[PDB]
Amino acid sequence: FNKKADENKVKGEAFLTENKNKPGVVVLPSGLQYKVINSGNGVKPGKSDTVTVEYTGRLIDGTVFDSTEKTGKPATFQVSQVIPGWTEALQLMPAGSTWEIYVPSGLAYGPRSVGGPIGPNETLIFKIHLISVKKSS
Question: What CATH fold (topology level) applies to the domain 31-137?
Fold first, then answer.
């Protein structure tokens, strides 16, 4: 059981290790690193912000675990309703922006068997395409 758990710890920590090559890698107060494609553009509130976006997430396992785009239904949630790491990054994501964040387990639920959305000792990649905040306020 743990053989696979640790197997994830190495493959994930390695992915992010090499990932550091991606230009624009900037660490956040929560420890989030990402690559900026289109930053700014629209306005928006702090972590109490509510935005509608579409994303495709996949586990370091190489297989998609869940996609809101393919389902045919956009993803709608507030930045303060997600894991710690995410709440920090999404709080800085302005309407219309486009960031890709990769948060290692140690920054989310933890590499321990308490890995919520992010598998245990699994590094995941997230593609967030923000359209607008609360009806483009």
Answer: Chitinase A; domain 3 (3.10.50)
